[PDB]
Amino acid sequence: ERTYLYRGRILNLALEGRYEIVEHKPAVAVIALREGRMLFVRQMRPAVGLAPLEIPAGLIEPGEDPLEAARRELAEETGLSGDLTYLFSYFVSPGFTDEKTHVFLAENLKEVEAHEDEAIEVVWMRPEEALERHQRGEVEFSATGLVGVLYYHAFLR
Amino acid sequence: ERTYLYRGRILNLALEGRYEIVEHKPAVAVIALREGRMLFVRQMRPAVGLAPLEIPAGLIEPGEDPLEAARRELAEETGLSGDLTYLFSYFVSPGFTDEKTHVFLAENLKEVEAHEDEAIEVVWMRPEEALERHQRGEVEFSATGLVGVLYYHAFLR
């Protein structure tokens, strides 16, 4: 039976028997390549005290399906629109949360919204360089950033 | 300032200003290939109500570094030992948790512990087949499972 300890803004905390469970909205993430650069983003993330390398991402809002949320986050975080293709999904950490992330590829990007606001910093970077900087200890990845880098190396070269 | 709402067994829930933060132990995950098959594992995960395809993984325990935890989880979940190489790390979902996962490659596997207990099910599967089953809607991934599949396609073929 699920017993709620905390009902919040993007999460709830529940106990289910002996299990501590964090309910969390589903998410999307968008992989985009242009001229050999991947579209990363960075923001301060208070949970970790730093700004990891991510790709455009966010929570699915009421009424949206993953494709629509992916469109919205690409536009809101980077001012771009593209033709989106669903790739795959993953549970971020199924040992404690139900957050599920739906990953899309974006092609044929166009700037639809003009951008020196760095709430969300747009970081175009070759994925090879992102991986090298991470191997040198100079940047951290989110799961979405790492998935973007690995997907590129696997399928986009 | 961090205010604790809940102090638990693998997580704490805190508020930091407007931010809801789940503190969680760091984790490890191990990518291993043998005869073209990747070493996946499955377990029932109450947070998601299903058993996603993962790779051997778990929490770093007091006193351990990531390499040691990776050795331990490979042995405890699959009965194997190997020569381990650190690959990269990622934050599972830095918008709300500090869980950081350290990913290793295992080579030269040997069975050191004998295995029909399916608490943790060992699932050797070609990564191409894992990806096809997921694309057909027949299995879900954890982040670690997806990272293993993408890493294989990028660097191990």
Say which CATH number the domain at B146 has. Answer: 3.90.79.10
In Å, how far is A81's CA from the nearest CA of chain B?
A: 23
**Distance of alpha carbon A35 from alpha carbon A38, whole angstroms:** 8
Number of compact structural domains in chain A: 1
A52 chain-B contacts, CB cut-off 8 A: 91, 94
- The whole domain housing B157 covers 1-157
**Long-range contacts of residues B11-18, Cβ cutoff 8 Å, at least 24 apart:** B11/A20, B11/A22, B11/A96, B11/B97, B13/A5, B13/A6, B13/A13, B16/A46, B17/A46
Q: How many CB atoms lie within 10 A of CB B116?
A: 4
**Distance of alpha carbon A114 from alpha carbon A117, whole angstroms:** 11
Enzyme catalytic residues of B: 116
A15-54 residues labelled b (16+ CB within 10 A) or e (exposed): eeeeebbbbbbbbbbbbbbeeeebbbbbeebbbbeebbbb
- The structure was resolved to a resolution in Å of 0.9
Identify whether the C-beta of residue B101 lies closer than 8 Å to the C-beta of residue B143: yes
> Helix, strand or coil for residue B121?
strand
**Distance of alpha carbon A97 from alpha carbon A82, whole angstroms:** 30
Q: How many CB atoms lie within 10 A of CB B108?
A: 10
A76 in a labelled binding site: no
CA distances (Å), origin A30, targets A41, A53, A138, B76: 11, 13, 23, 36
B21 chain-A contacts, CB cut-off 8 A: 46-47
Q: Which of A17, A18, A96, A23 is nearest to B45 (CA)?
A: A96
Please answer yes or no on whether B96 and A155 come within 8 Å at the CB atom.
no
Asked if A116 is an active-site residue, the reply is yes
Please answer yes or no on whether B92 and A143 come within 8 Å at the CB atom.
yes
How would you write chain A as a 3-class SS string?
CEEEEEECCCEEEEEECCEEEEEECCEEEEEEEECCEEEEEECCECCCCECCEECCEEECCCCCCHHHHHHHHHHHHHCEEEEEEEEEEEECCCCCECCEEEEEEEEEEEECCCCCCCCCEEEEECHHHHHHHHHCCCCCEEHHHHHHHHHHHHHCC
Q: Please, what is the Cα angle at B16 between B12 and B18, to 5 degrees?
A: 120
One DSSP character per residue, B3-66 reads EEEEE-SSEEEEEETTEEEEEE--EEEEEEEETTEEEEEE--BTTTTB--BB-SEEEPPTT--H
Partners of A155 in the β-ladder = none
**Distance of alpha carbon A18 from alpha carbon A143, whole angstroms:** 27
Please answer yes or no on whether B10 and A20 come within 8 Å at the CB atom.
yes
Please answer yes or no on whether A6 and B6 come within 8 Å at the CB atom.
yes
